[PDB]
Amino acid sequence: EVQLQQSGPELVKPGASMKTSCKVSGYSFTGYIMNWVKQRHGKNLEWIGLINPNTGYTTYNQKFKGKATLTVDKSSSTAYMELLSLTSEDSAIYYCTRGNYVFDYWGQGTTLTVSSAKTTPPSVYPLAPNSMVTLGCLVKGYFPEPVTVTWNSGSLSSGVHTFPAVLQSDLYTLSSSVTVPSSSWPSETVTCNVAHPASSTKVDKKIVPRD
Amino acid sequence: EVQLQQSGPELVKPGASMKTSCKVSGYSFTGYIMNWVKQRHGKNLEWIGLINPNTGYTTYNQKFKGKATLTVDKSSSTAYMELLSLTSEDSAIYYCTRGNYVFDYWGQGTTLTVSSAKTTPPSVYPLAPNSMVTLGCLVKGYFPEPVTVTWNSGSLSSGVHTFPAVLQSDLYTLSSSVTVPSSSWPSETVTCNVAHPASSTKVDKKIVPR
Amino acid sequence: QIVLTQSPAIMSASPGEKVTMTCSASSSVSYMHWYQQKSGTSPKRWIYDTSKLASGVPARFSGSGSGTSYSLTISSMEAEDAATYYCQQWSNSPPTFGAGAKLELKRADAAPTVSIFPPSSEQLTSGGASVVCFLNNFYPKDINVKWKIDGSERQNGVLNSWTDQDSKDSTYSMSSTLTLTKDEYERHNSYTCEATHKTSTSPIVKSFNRN
Amino acid sequence: QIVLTQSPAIMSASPGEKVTMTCSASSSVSYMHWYQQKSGTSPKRWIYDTSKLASGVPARFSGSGSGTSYSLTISSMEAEDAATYYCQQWSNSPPTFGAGAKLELKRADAAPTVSIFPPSSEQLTSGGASVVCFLNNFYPKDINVKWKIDGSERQNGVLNSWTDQDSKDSTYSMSSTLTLTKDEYERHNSYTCEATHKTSTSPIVKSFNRN
Amino acid sequence: RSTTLLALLALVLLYLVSGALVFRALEQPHEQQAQRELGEVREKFLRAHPCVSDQELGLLIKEVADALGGGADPETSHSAWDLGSAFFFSGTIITTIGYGNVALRTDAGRLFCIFYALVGIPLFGILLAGVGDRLGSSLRHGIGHIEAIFLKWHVPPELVRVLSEMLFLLIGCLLFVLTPTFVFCYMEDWSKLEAIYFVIVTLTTVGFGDYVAGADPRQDSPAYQPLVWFWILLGLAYFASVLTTIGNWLRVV
Amino acid sequence: RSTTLLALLALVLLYLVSGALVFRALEQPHEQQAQRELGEVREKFLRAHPCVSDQELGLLIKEVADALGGGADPETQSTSAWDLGSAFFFSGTIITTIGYGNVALRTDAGRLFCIFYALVGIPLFGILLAGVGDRLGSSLRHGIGHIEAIFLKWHVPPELVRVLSEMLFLLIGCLLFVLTPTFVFCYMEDWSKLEAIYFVIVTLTTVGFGDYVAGADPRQDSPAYQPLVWFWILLGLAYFASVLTTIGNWLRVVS
Ligand SMILES: [Ca+2]
Ligand SMILES: [Ca+2]
Ligand SMILES: [Ca+2]
Ligand SMILES: [K+]
Ligand SMILES: [K+]
Ligand SMILES: [K+]
Ligand SMILES: [K+]
Ligand SMILES: [K+]
Ligand SMILES: [K+]
Ligand SMILES: [K+]
């Protein structure tokens, strides 16, 4: 079982640099070319460059010649990528992937978030208003990812949509909808539970019908 | 720890063929070129050929073109050498060794014996005749190698030589010497313990004065 | 340098259906490789050297082409095949990728369940006013959302978040959030969320008056 | 077909002596490698690329050379350096080796302790007659053995066996074995084993009468 | 002549342009074949050897190209400037053939080549005229005896002369064109087409250098290797007559 | 003359042997170094790439060699030598018997057509050259007459003036067809003065090695340039034809 184990998510300030690692196991690290690939939602997969871990030879994409330095530690069979002078546009998923013509094995990916933002707990706002009725939670102005959103502590999990968070001016915002039979609400208390591990925040908002 | 573990010694009839193996561990078998080397007592170490375990590519020393077939099993990271229509000129130690310029890691070697001879147990004969006395055991007409000689079941380990075996009429002969103070013999018993594992033979000879 | 163009960017199949997706190259290449990606996982080598299947890949998948035109085919679509496919080339440095083609599961057209929520009192007290629209459980994906304040369309302070096709019902859902200052919110009275979907000639519109 | 010449084929060094063995190439070679072999074990990479020491190799070892002449040197001879040293080349296929250079430890001269042993009764009953001579714990290795039957030399049915240099006292030992039919044995009466060593102008003669 | 030369010039230009059209038609389709073969070799090598980056294989090919450029030879002797090959090279100069399958690398080599040619070509030109006449007269002596047989079957002697001259340029052809094409087919592992192309490119003194016997004593028939310079010398003489007869025909019409 | 021809033949052989010795002396050391450098490149590549055998790297280099030999470029990995301009020029190299060969025919059809193209083409061009030669002679001698007459005007002897005119003829040609082109090519091809002279002479002798070819450079956007040179070749060759015949006469005078 060939395996590329990348280090965890990275949160860095604009201008700072970041170093990330890719530990191989299940083959000879030095027998195979290691590449790095950038994934950003609005764009193609981008090849950053490669290192021959046996020779130390490096080639870069012209686009990343300034930005990225690839190195290897042969003894610990670990590949490194360093990203310098980080901008908003560097925020992406980065993969280490093996191969010299096709990328045959990939790491699980590491997420980079470039942001001035400080660890900020979310504001949680209730969204109150046929057989079914839809309630909601607005979870806004938090940093960093993730938050966990449940409904009545996870006992209410069907009829739920939690939307992907969106970075707006260095802070994340998301919403969750729950659709329940109108016999259920407001007969039954429906609370959305938002947890932000980074800020050790746990907030519970009851959805109350407007007056 | 890079390691090349070869299969054990082999005995085959003239004209027969033979296949030996080398399992690699501690590195990626498919990353490095594998070679076989022949060591005969008379001649130079002799490169037989190489195989690329990743591509199956092979080249042979012109001297071994017809003789030897190299193959690999990628899944068991094992290299194989086959030798065909064997003559006594093929009796040698064969090594697998890794490298594409220098042979950086070697197996422990495998001894090939080409012989019409059949598993024979040794006749063991005692050798009886200063401060010191020298006794011996002649161990003759055994096949194949090895035998071990010990003296008083290893109680005598200092003053002990076993000579290498020689071919005497298509079978092996050696002797072992032990040197003990003259006060000791024949005052006290000195017996050689001979083992020939091939024939499952385990014989003791008491050295008796003439 | 070499550009790989995947058209169309989105395509849809019922199980049992044949699917063909194409990769056209800006200039000729000897081999095309393909990756499969599903939400929350690294790309996987799927087909390499144009038509070779990677180890786990089921036989319904095939690849073909030469020069500037290459294709990936599913002889008979299965549900587990809904995913994003990328083509890539390394006949010229640097290696390059397509933008990716999303393959979705086809299902019966479904109208969006649309709900509008006024700003919560809690948010207004901090001076912000988010009006949230949930457009839930619709198919196909194509939808256009317009915000109208006192009849006048507004496209500034609007943030849209989509979920990926649901693995159970194969529907899509999105949230649209008009974010105003309390001041702009309190100036006007009528707030409408208007959705344009295949399922109706007449737009789907939910509204509220501040009174 | 490049030939490597190691001369002398055998050489000796007292501990603390500087030792240098040379390898002559039949045509020019860019790099020479060297192996160490001790009886019972495979060759070990000792020096590669003319002057690079393999991992464990102690610093007292150097290599040097260029063109058709290469050398291995020991600054100060140690006990554990007694072994056979082989040069090999791979600037031309096929790679080739020197016949090897055996390096023995030098020590004080020692006279062979000589013993003769008449056929055992047990062996005569089988119809064979083996007369055995042990020349033990002598130095140097240069030695001549002669058998005399009734004072006339016999050079037929004699098999000789030498030990390697003893790892503890640095001496050598050999066996000489005259094998006769019981008939040839019983014909004659005086059996003498005569050893000619540097340590004496007069042969060392051990004898017995069959009587 | 004024009319003649301008007419002839235009004729030659048209000939060149029509030649251009024919060559482009036949050759432009296959222009990138060698680039495709290099690419095939590169990609096949990366697939076989995963320890090699496309960029490291890249430098190898550049470094190998420079070595070959300097006259290095893929080895698996072979000296193009050993006395045998260097003699043959000097031969390519004075003959105006100039294969160029081996190039001069030194500015000194080039400088000497200039004076060597400038003195050497006319010297060979003189000897060629000489060797042409000597063989010509000797052949003509032979021609007369053949003419006698034709004479004794009552063929008009002017017809006999042309018949003999035609036989003249046919026996020469068989002797110098066909034998070598057969020889080269066997010796060089060429097709009979490749061999005639070589022979004619050679004896016309065009000397592209895509095909060369090499006059390199290798083994088996080492004597023959420089010996083909003999065929060249003799062949050139025969072909001189052939070229003039084709030339005279164009003048005649 | 049969004795003289044997003498002449041996003279040429000695000339070739002396040429061979000089060429070997000057060229072989660099060819041996190139061979050593190929070997150094292989040995470094094996040390860098343990998954490659000596013999597999051997096939790569042989296969690469064959591809480069076919005109493959090491610098690129993409995918005109036979554009109407270059194809015209190639046809030019045939009939002139120059035969640079810097681009080879790959098709059996190409080669077969080349045979008959040359067999008809060379004698045709031969005729034109004789024509251009005669014209050239008339032009220069009539022109040289006027300046020739200025020497006659200052009372110099008529037989002296013929040889002065003969020498003057050689000077005129060289300026026009040797020195000017060498200077032209020096600037246009980014060659050294000596490279350019080497090219010019190798061209006008009709040797045409193909190590140096004016216009051939892929980068240059000057297709009109390359045929323009072919007019220089046309005019140059007649000049050099005269020179080559005359130096033969000098050797005739020496013999
Ligand atoms: Ca076996
Ligand atoms: Ca060469
Ligand atoms: Ca040669
Ligand atoms: K060439
Ligand atoms: K000519
Ligand atoms: K050429
Ligand atoms: K010519
Ligand atoms: K030529
Ligand atoms: K030429
Ligand atoms: K040429």
Side-chain angles (χ1 to χ4, degrees), chain A, chain B, chain C, chain D, chain E residues 1-76 79-253, chain F residues 1-254:
Chain A
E1 180 149 355
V2 175
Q3 176 157 356
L4 276 62
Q5 180 80 54
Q6 294 186 226
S7 46
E10 303 249 0
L11 276 18
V12 311
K13 304 283 181 160
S17 77
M18 157 263 216
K19 194 171 176 185
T20 188
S21 62
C22 179
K23 202 194 193 326
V24 310
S25 78
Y27 76 96
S28 196
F29 185 57
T30 63
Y32 295 81
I33 303 309
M34 288 294 326
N35 310 259
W36 294 77
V37 172
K38 175 173 181 180
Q39 190 166 48
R40 209 177 147 98
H41 166 273
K43 284 171 169 78
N44 296 13
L45 283 161
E46 274 178 272
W47 176 86
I48 296 160
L50 68 79
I51 185 155
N52 182 326
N54 189 50
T55 68
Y57 183 100
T58 61
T59 307
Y60 299 87
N61 191 322
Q62 202 88 354
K63 293 176 215 295
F64 291 89
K65 273 186 77 62
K67 287 222 74 91
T69 312
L70 308 185
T71 62
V72 302
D73 178 332
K74 291 187 217 169
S75 86
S76 69
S77 37
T78 303
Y80 298 91
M81 179 173 66
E82 200 160 42
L83 292 181
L84 315 174
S85 260
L86 289 172
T87 169
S88 164
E89 290 304 282
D90 293 325
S91 294
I93 301 171
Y94 295 90
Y95 307 93
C96 59
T97 185
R98 199 194 70 164
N100 68 343
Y101 70 97
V102 60
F103 309 116
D104 50 6
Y105 298 97
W106 296 67
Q108 78 277 25
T110 182
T111 293
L112 171 66
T113 313
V114 184
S115 174
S116 287
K118 331 215 122 186
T119 294
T120 310
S123 291
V124 180
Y125 301 125
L127 306 174
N130 57 324
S131 64
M132 300 305 272
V133 56
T134 306
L135 308 175
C137 261
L138 193 56
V139 179
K140 72 173 326 203
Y142 74 90
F143 188 87
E145 295 258 68
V147 300
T148 63
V149 181
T150 66
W151 290 95
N152 305 341
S153 314
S155 70
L156 171 54
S157 55
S158 37
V160 175
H161 298 115
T162 306
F163 294 91
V166 299
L167 269 182
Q168 206 198 9
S169 83
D170 294 359
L171 295 177
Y172 290 99
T173 300
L174 75 73
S175 34
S176 190
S177 61
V178 61
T179 299
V180 303
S182 49
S183 55
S184 281
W185 186 92
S187 271
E188 197 63 20
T189 83
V190 166
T191 71
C192 107
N193 322 90
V194 183
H196 188 244
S199 65
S200 285
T201 295
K202 178 57 166 196
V203 165
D204 304 323
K205 255 284 143 61
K206 194 191 292 188
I207 316 313
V208 175
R210 292 158 200 260
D211 66 298
Chain B
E1 179 168 22
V2 174
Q3 281 257 331
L4 276 61
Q5 169 90 318
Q6 288 177 256
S7 43
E10 286 203 39
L11 165 62
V12 305
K13 293 283 212 179
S17 66
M18 156 271 213
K19 197 188 188 78
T20 193
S21 70
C22 176
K23 179 155 206 149
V24 311
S25 74
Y27 83 93
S28 187
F29 183 58
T30 57
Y32 296 72
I33 298 300
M34 276 289 324
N35 311 266
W36 297 78
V37 176
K38 172 175 188 179
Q39 179 162 51
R40 222 163 136 73
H41 156 57
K43 303 190 154 203
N44 304 5
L45 285 158
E46 219 176 359
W47 179 83
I48 299 163
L50 67 79
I51 188 156
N52 188 322
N54 189 59
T55 65
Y57 181 84
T58 63
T59 43
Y60 299 91
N61 184 343
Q62 203 68 10
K63 292 182 149 79
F64 291 95
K65 200 127 284 173
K67 262 283 175 199
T69 302
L70 306 184
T71 53
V72 308
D73 176 335
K74 283 179 217 199
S75 78
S76 69
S77 50
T78 297
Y80 294 92
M81 176 182 63
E82 188 159 38
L83 291 172
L84 311 173
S85 43
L86 288 174
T87 75
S88 67
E89 273 194 312
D90 295 309
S91 296
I93 296 168
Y94 294 85
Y95 306 93
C96 63
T97 184
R98 194 185 84 165
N100 62 343
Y101 72 103
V102 62
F103 308 113
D104 53 2
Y105 295 101
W106 299 63
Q108 76 278 22
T110 184
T111 300
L112 171 62
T113 309
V114 188
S115 165
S116 286
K118 322 186 170 172
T119 290
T120 309
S123 318
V124 179
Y125 304 126
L127 304 178
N130 319 354
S131 66
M132 291 291 161
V133 188
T134 303
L135 312 170
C137 274
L138 182 66
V139 178
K140 93 166 300 226
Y142 73 90
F143 187 88
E145 288 257 55
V147 295
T148 63
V149 187
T150 67
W151 290 93
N152 297 351
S153 320
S155 288
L156 293 177
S157 58
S158 45
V160 176
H161 312 126
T162 309
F163 297 84
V166 292
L167 270 182
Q168 204 169 8
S169 54
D170 316 345
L171 302 165
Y172 293 117
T173 304
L174 66 73
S175 20
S176 188
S177 87
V178 60
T179 291
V180 296
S182 52
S183 37
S184 286
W185 190 90
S187 186
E188 300 304 333
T189 316
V190 170
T191 76
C192 73
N193 325 83
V194 174
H196 187 238
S199 68
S200 302
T201 293
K202 209 181 298 293
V203 171
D204 289 4
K205 283 323 303 158
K206 173 190 180 93
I207 313 308
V208 165
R210 299 287 305 199
Chain C
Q1 293 307 51
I2 292 189
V3 178
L4 300 175
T5 279
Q6 301 190 247
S7 268
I10 315 292
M11 64 214 318
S12 71
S14 311
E17 208 157 300
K18 183 214 192 76
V19 181
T20 300
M21 62 201 108
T22 70
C23 185
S24 90
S26 77
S27 56
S28 90
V29 305
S30 326
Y31 299 104
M32 196 67 65
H33 318 302
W34 296 85
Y35 308 82
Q36 184 189 73
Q37 194 176 26
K38 296 183 169 198
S39 273
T41 70
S42 314
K44 291 169 136 94
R45 183 176 72 164
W46 212 248
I47 292 146
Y48 66 100
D49 286 359
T50 299
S51 59
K52 288 184 204 198
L53 266 55
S55 181
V57 174
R60 75 184 93 101
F61 287 92
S62 80
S64 63
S66 75
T68 55
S69 182
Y70 288 91
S71 80
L72 188 171
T73 299
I74 320 187
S75 61
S76 183
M77 170 73 162
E78 296 269 287
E80 72 211 65
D81 296 343
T84 303
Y85 296 91
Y86 298 92
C87 57
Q88 84 108 337
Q89 144 285 332
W90 209 338
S91 302
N92 287 28
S93 268
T96 50
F97 291 95
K102 211 199 228 85
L103 180 62
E104 48 152 344
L105 260 163
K106 214 189 291 192
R107 62 147 282 145
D109 294 354
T113 298
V114 180
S115 314
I116 198 173
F117 299 85
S120 61
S121 36
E122 300 87 336
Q123 188 188 5
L124 287 172
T125 82
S126 76
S130 283
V131 195
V132 181
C133 198
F134 297 127
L135 295 85
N136 279 180
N137 299 312
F138 61 90
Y139 186 95
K141 183 168 185 156
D142 271 303
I143 196 147
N144 308 146
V145 182
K146 307 159 51 164
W147 289 92
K148 296 184 169 217
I149 309 166
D150 294 350
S152 293
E153 176 181 10
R154 171 74 170 250
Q155 296 197 326
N156 185 301
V158 167
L159 301 169
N160 294 339
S161 192
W162 290 265
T163 57
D164 208 339
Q165 188 170 46
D166 194 317
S167 49
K168 170 141 215 171
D169 64 26
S170 319
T171 67
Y172 298 88
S173 310
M174 79 169 269
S175 77
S176 198
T177 301
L178 180 57
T179 311
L180 313 160
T181 184
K182 179 200 199 155
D183 196 39
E184 205 144 0
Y185 175 66
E186 282 199 345
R187 264 180 257 155
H188 307 259
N189 192 246
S190 179
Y191 289 90
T192 83
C193 174
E194 197 171 282
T196 296
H197 199 230
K198 187 188 184 105
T199 302
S200 285
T201 66
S202 60
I204 298 96
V205 53
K206 288 317 189 69
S207 180
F208 73 86
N209 308 330
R210 208 163 41 76
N211 38 343
Chain D
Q1 274 220 55
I2 292 186
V3 180
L4 301 177
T5 297
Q6 302 186 258
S7 308
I10 188 145
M11 49 196 310
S12 74
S14 296
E17 283 191 27
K18 181 153 189 282
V19 181
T20 297
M21 51 210 105
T22 78
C23 175
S24 174
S26 74
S27 58
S28 193
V29 160
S30 321
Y31 294 104
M32 194 64 73
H33 323 303
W34 298 89
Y35 309 92
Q36 185 192 70
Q37 192 179 27
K38 306 177 146 179
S39 90
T41 65
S42 62
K44 288 191 180 75
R45 187 184 53 164
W46 214 246
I47 288 159
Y48 64 103
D49 280 354
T50 301
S51 44
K52 289 182 176 195
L53 271 60
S55 173
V57 172
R60 76 169 156 283
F61 284 91
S62 81
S64 179
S66 65
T68 54
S69 173
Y70 288 89
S71 74
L72 197 166
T73 298
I74 318 181
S75 64
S76 64
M77 179 71 176
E78 289 267 30
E80 73 208 62
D81 295 343
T84 310
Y85 292 92
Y86 297 95
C87 59
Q88 81 104 350
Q89 149 283 332
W90 208 338
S91 303
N92 274 227
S93 282
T96 57
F97 297 87
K102 191 167 186 310
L103 182 60
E104 63 142 11
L105 250 170
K106 213 185 308 184
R107 59 146 287 146
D109 283 354
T113 304
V114 180
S115 306
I116 198 171
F117 303 93
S120 71
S121 51
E122 326 196 26
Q123 188 190 8
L124 291 172
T125 74
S126 68
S130 278
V131 199
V132 175
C133 194
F134 293 171
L135 300 80
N136 284 358
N137 295 110
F138 63 90
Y139 188 89
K141 192 173 158 153
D142 306 286
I143 195 164
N144 198 16
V145 186
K146 275 187 196 166
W147 284 95
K148 283 173 174 159
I149 60 150
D150 297 344
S152 51
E153 184 179 341
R154 185 145 195 95
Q155 206 163 21
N156 300 63
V158 174
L159 289 179
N160 288 355
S161 198
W162 288 266
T163 62
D164 296 331
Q165 188 165 48
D166 191 48
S167 51
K168 275 220 102 71
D169 69 350
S170 305
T171 66
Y172 300 87
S173 304
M174 76 167 278
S175 88
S176 205
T177 297
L178 182 49
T179 310
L180 310 164
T181 164
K182 181 200 201 176
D183 292 341
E184 286 179 351
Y185 176 60
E186 284 185 331
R187 271 157 206 168
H188 308 261
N189 190 61
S190 86
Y191 290 93
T192 84
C193 167
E194 179 192 309
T196 318
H197 205 237
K198 170 190 196 211
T199 50
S200 188
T201 60
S202 56
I204 311 199
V205 177
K206 285 328 178 56
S207 182
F208 72 85
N209 290 343
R210 198 168 47 72
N211 284 356
Chain E
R1 168 183 311 264
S2 300
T3 320
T4 303
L5 298 175
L6 297 178
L8 198 65
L9 168 57
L11 179 63
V12 163
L13 284 157
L14 180 44
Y15 190 56
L16 284 187
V17 168
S18 62
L21 298 176
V22 175
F23 277 125
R24 168 166 56 75
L26 294 188
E27 282 303 327
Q28 196 166 69
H30 303 82
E31 261 190 293
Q32 284 298 279
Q33 187 48 32
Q35 268 297 160
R36 275 214 300 94
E37 284 163 356
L38 181 59
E40 286 179 20
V41 166
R42 266 190 328 95
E43 288 180 294
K44 192 196 178 268
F45 195 83
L46 295 173
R47 277 153 181 77
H49 306 290
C51 65
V52 190
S53 68
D54 181 37
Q55 290 305 292
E56 281 163 314
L57 186 51
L59 301 178
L60 174 59
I61 287 161
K62 284 170 206 155
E63 278 182 59
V64 166
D66 295 335
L68 301 164
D73 199 63
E75 194 210 14
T76 307
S79 182
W81 295 110
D82 64 8
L83 199 46
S85 300
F87 169 83
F88 180 75
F89 176 79
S90 318
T92 69
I93 307 186
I94 65 175
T95 55
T96 77
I97 296 171
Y99 288 126
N101 62 314
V102 182
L104 299 168
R105 307 282 71 205
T106 78
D107 283 357
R110 281 142 186 176
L111 173 57
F112 172 78
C113 178
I114 286 168
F115 289 123
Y116 189 82
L118 214 20
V119 173
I121 297 166
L123 167 57
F124 183 86
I126 289 305
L127 174 147
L128 193 58
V131 171
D133 287 2
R134 190 73 207 80
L135 183 61
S137 183
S138 299
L139 278 168
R140 207 160 188 168
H141 183 62
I143 282 170
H145 301 309
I146 316 158
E147 287 180 353
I149 294 175
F150 295 135
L151 177 53
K152 289 204 173 186
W153 288 111
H154 201 240
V155 184
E158 310 74 359
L159 178 44
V160 170
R161 297 293 169 278
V162 172
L163 189 28
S164 75
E165 186 62 14
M166 186 191 78
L167 188 61
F168 175 81
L169 62 82
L170 276 189
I171 297 296
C173 180
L174 171 57
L175 213 172
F176 302 137
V177 175
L178 274 53
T179 311
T181 53
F182 280 44
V183 162
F184 296 141
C185 202
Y186 187 73
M187 280 299 292
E188 309 291 336
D189 207 22
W190 298 338
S191 70
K192 68 172 198 272
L193 182 151
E194 282 171 308
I196 292 162
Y197 173 72
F198 167 63
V199 150
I200 275 181
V201 163
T202 304
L203 291 189
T204 49
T205 79
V206 181
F208 282 136
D210 45 1
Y211 294 80
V212 187
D216 203 351
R218 195 181 290 192
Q219 199 170 27
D220 191 58
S221 185
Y224 185 51
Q225 294 298 94
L227 186 147
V228 299
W229 199 79
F230 211 51
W231 153 66
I232 293 169
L233 177 48
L234 299 176
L236 279 170
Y238 156 65
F239 230 73
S241 183
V242 171
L243 268 296
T244 54
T245 59
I246 304 310
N248 200 41
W249 184 42
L250 177 276
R251 291 178 64 79
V252 157
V253 189
Chain F
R1 299 181 218 166
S2 282
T3 57
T4 65
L5 267 67
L6 268 76
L8 197 57
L9 181 53
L11 193 162
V12 151
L13 265 57
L14 282 174
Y15 190 71
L16 287 179
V17 172
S18 59
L21 293 173
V22 169
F23 279 134
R24 164 168 80 183
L26 287 171
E27 290 297 313
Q28 191 184 45
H30 297 269
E31 176 211 38
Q32 289 176 150
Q33 183 49 32
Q35 192 64 53
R36 268 186 297 283
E37 280 162 0
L38 183 53
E40 286 162 10
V41 168
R42 304 196 314 101
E43 296 190 284
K44 275 152 61 217
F45 197 82
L46 289 182
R47 280 158 182 75
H49 303 292
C51 75
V52 179
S53 76
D54 196 16
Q55 281 318 299
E56 281 175 311
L57 177 53
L59 286 190
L60 172 66
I61 288 160
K62 200 234 166 164
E63 286 182 296
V64 162
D66 297 344
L68 296 167
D73 178 10
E75 301 303 325
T76 68
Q77 289 177 322
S78 262
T79 312
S80 182
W82 293 100
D83 61 352
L84 198 275
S86 304
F88 170 85
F89 165 96
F90 172 86
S91 320
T93 73
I94 308 194
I95 65 170
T96 56
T97 85
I98 291 171
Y100 286 129
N102 59 318
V103 185
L105 302 168
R106 309 187 58 76
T107 69
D108 292 324
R111 287 137 181 171
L112 178 56
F113 173 78
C114 187
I115 283 166
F116 291 120
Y117 191 80
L119 285 186
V120 170
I122 298 165
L124 175 52
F125 183 81
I127 297 308
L128 173 60
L129 199 67
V132 172
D134 281 8
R135 208 70 164 198
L136 185 65
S138 180
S139 166
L140 299 205
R141 292 188 61 76
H142 270 288
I144 287 167
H146 300 163
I147 314 181
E148 185 171 2
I150 288 174
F151 312 154
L152 286 174
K153 171 193 294 177
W154 300 352
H155 317 283
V156 299
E159 73 289 355
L160 260 73
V161 168
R162 297 171 307 88
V163 189
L164 286 169
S165 311
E166 185 63 16
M167 298 306 88
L168 191 269
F169 162 98
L170 189 57
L171 273 281
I172 281 185
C174 280
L175 183 291
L176 293 190
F177 311 120
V178 174
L179 283 305
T180 311
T182 55
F183 282 71
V184 163
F185 295 135
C186 192
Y187 196 60
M188 294 299 175
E189 289 296 322
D190 201 354
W191 297 340
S192 79
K193 59 194 188 271
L194 185 147
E195 282 174 315
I197 286 161
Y198 171 81
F199 168 67
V200 154
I201 284 180
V202 162
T203 307
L204 297 190
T205 49
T206 88
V207 172
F209 282 135
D211 40 8
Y212 292 80
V213 182
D217 198 54
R219 187 185 194 188
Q220 287 170 327
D221 268 32
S222 298
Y225 176 75
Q226 213 161 0
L228 192 158
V229 171
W230 179 88
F231 298 97
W232 160 66
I233 291 171
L234 174 56
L235 273 156
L237 280 174
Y239 171 45
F240 229 87
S242 300
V243 170
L244 283 169
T245 54
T246 58
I247 179 154
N249 307 338
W250 181 90
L251 292 155
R252 296 322 296 151
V253 163
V254 163

